[PDB]
Ligand binder design. Structure first.
Ligand SMILES: O=C(O)CNC(=O)C(=O)O
Ligand SMILES: [Mg+2]
Ligand code: NI
Ligand SMILES: [Zn+2]
Length: 331
């Protein structure tokens, strides 16, 4: 069995290997990359996402989100308070202000220490979930707006034609902006490209051990667990590495820098934070190996998780027994 300790693997494809996306995902899995839940892909030196980032300041962040925490430093939730619209140039200036900028630090480890010590005492503003793409249309390799769609994959594997679309999302971050512990919708893969700016630190639980994280989360968030049998789908709960280690939960960590891709694998729980002003692009995707995970994915039906249009068909075809309850949660 490849990668039996479930370590995060880092890949350096050549320009030739970078042509066929599906083939390279399958290669990484042949080497055991999925056992970690997360892999890093460093593009060949010949490749670029676009020519420059000099002209992005007029993109609008219609609904910036202020991430307000409650709890203790290592075990907290966050809620998202909506703020007035602002452009990417305005948000960049805000991120760089004395109130929000990255503090002086020695290295990524010192900054990680400062994040976990101090996150709860601040409320950073995240420009998340913005439909769009920063890949040039002429970038042919690993262009996250040109991937095979999940609807087409389901149709190829299972024969059923379904409605829905699959487009990328932009994320504009600042120091301390936070992504809570989650798996993807329907336990899909994700791919994330850090286009520019400061790093993103990731934490991940191997898919084979995801239920250990869920059991800890039910202990640590007992009111939320009574409210919903899949409350991590709400994407609000944070647990620090120190608390994970105290409770014996297997996990790994890695820092993504600008110019790098990360892939999350089906049922790989992940969480993390941004180091300073940055911009990422991410999208969900599927492979044949996903189908079995999609069929078994948990679902939130309490009303909180509320998701895209395209998840309807995935539930309806892969999980017909759960469909009626889940759809009630959507309405
Ligand atoms: O970058 C972020 O805020 C969150 N991204 C992801 O959870 C992802 O790419 O799957
Ligand atoms: Mg612009
Ligand atoms: Ni994710
Ligand atoms: Zn719920």
């Amino acid at each position: 069995a490849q990668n039996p300790n479930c370590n995060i693997m880092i890949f350096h494809p050549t320009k030739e290997e970078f042509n066929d996306f599906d083939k390279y995902i399958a290669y990484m899995e042949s080497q055991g990359a999925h056992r970690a839940g997360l892999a890093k892909i460093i593009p060949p030196k010949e490749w670029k996402a676009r020519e420059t980032y000099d002209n992005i300041s007029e993109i609008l962040i219609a609904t910036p989100l202020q991430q307000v925490a409650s709890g203790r430093a290592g075990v907290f939730t966050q809620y998202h308070k909506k703020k007035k619209a602002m452009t990417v140039g305005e948000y960049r200036h805000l991120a760089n202000s004395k109130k929000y900028q990255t503090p002086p630090h020695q290295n990524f480890e010192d900054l990680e220490r400062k994040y976990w010590k101090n996150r709860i005492y601040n409320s950073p503003i995240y420009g998340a979930d913005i439909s769009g793409s920063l890949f040039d249309e002429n970038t042919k390799q690993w262009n996250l707006g040109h991937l095979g769609t999940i609807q087409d994959l389901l149709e190829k594997e299972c024969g059923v034609v379904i409605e829905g679309v699959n487009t990328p999302y932009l994320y504009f971050g600042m120091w301390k902006t936070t992504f809570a512990w989650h798996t993807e919708d329907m336990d899909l893969y994700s791919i994330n490209y850090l286009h520019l700016g400061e790093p993103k630190t990731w934490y991940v639980v191997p898919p084979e051990h995801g239920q250990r994280l869920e059991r800890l989360a039910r202990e640590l968030f007992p009111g939320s667990s009574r409210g919903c049998g899949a409350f991590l789908r709400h994407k609000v709960a944070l647990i620090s590495p120190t608390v994970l280690k105290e409770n014996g939960i297997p996990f790994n960590r890695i820092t993504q820098e600008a110019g790098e891709f990360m892939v999350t694998f089906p049922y790989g729980y992940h969480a993390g934070f941004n180091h300073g002003f940055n911009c990422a692009e991410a999208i969900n995707f599927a492979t044949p190996r996903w189908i079995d995970y999609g069929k078994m994915a948990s679902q939130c039906s309490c009303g909180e998780a509320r998701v895209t249009f395209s998840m309807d068909a995935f539930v309806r075809i892969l999980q017909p027994e759960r469909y009626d309850l889940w759809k009630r949660g959507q309405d």
